[PDB]
Design a protein around this nucleic acid. Structure first.
Ligand SMILES: [Ca+2]
Ligand SMILES: [Ca+2]
Length: 296
DNA sequence: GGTGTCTGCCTATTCACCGATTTTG
DNA sequence: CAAAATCGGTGAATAGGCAGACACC
């Protein structure tokens, strides 16, 4: 019930969020309410993860995000110390670290209770401007000053495989590809491991090829949006390098079940039963019940 | 009677996921 | 030939967010 600290950090870099909110109290101008919060949104299927986090930090409350999503939110200021203490001993790796540093800075402003002053609000506004989506339209109208939006870029290395397990449990992918040969009935099995991330962490993505000794970064795109995908398709790399890593460092959530099914198919290929008409039908049945196909 | 804490509810997109074709040893 | 590399997607679980009730200093 108490997830490993480095697995938790890796998952946080994938799903976590450090939020600084600045709003008007009772729709009154020149009177701003400021508050900090940490939150992680997951599908209802992985609500157990959020509860495991809730047992590790002993803070936060889980509520419904939507009809298919729950979210763990830490809104108590005193409880935010638990979050800060954690990420000081197990630091973030992605560009979210920059958000955390800005998050901690706002914490100090609020801890000194300077957020109840004019100059304190002006400081938090400048902090929020570099956090996440930055200042909204209404906030930008209230503070038309040329505030710096940019932040110092984060360039860190993977601390350990325990972090990687948490990060992969969040953004990894274990897929089975049935390359159906056209003009025939024969189908070949290819295993597919993937880790997707925005282009803003390109440096960290490229390090995956070295840290795992395999795979290649694929620059993918949708409309005008772009991201990267670390992909391993060679069975030797998957069976000898990829799989043993996540056998050592266990995954969390429903994706663990996909990995277990993923290894079950790997064993069949390892025994060359994937070429068997019987073994392929078995693979076809396993594939149908993993990932998006999994309904139970 | 102000501020902090909590929750219902929302939107844009960064993901996870997908089948298939072409290249290579 | 079978595997590996490569292509070309896209629905949605995300990653942040908006607004206000209200317990409490
Ligand atoms: Ca992410
Ligand atoms: Ca995820």
């Amino acid at each position: 019930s108490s997830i490993n600290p480095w697995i938790l950090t890796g998952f946080a870099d994938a799903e976590g969020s450090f939020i600084l909110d600045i709003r008007n109290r009772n729709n009154e101008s020149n009177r701003y309410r400021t508050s900090l919060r940490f939150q992680i949104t997951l599908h209802n299927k992985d609500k157990s993860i959020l509860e495991n986090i809730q047992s590790t930090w002993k803070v936060g409350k889980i509520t419904n995000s939507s009809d298919r999503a729950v979210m763990l939110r830490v809104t108590r200021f005193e409880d935010l110390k638990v979050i800060i203490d954690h990420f000081e001993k197990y630091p973030l790796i992605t560009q979210k670290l920059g958000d955390y540093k800005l998050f901690k800075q706002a914490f100090s402003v609020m801890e000194n209770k300077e957020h109840l002053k004019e100059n304190g609000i002006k400081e938090l506004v400048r902090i929020k401007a570099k956090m996440n989506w930055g200042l909204n339209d209404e906030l930008k109208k209230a503070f038309p000053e040329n505030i710096s939006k940019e932040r110092p870029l984060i360039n860190k290395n993977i601390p350990n495989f325990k972090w990687l397990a948490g990060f992969t449990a969040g953004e990894g992918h274990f897929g089975v590809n049935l390359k159906k040969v056209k003009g025939t009935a024969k189908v070949y099995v290819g295993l597919r491991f993937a880790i997707s991330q925005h282009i803003r962490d390109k440096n960290l993505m490229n390090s995956l090829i070295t840290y795992l000794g395999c795979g290649s970064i694929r620059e993918k795109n949708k409309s005008e949006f772009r991201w990267l995908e670390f992909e391993v398709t060679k069975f030797s790399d998957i069976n000898d390098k990829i799989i043993p890593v996540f056998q050592e460092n266990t995954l969390i959530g429903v994706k663990l079940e996909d990995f277990e099914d993923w290894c079950k198919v790997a064993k069949l290929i390892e025994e060359k039963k994937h070429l068997t008409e019987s073994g392929l039908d078995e693979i076809k049945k396993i594939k149908l019940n993993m990932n998006k196909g999994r309904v139970f």
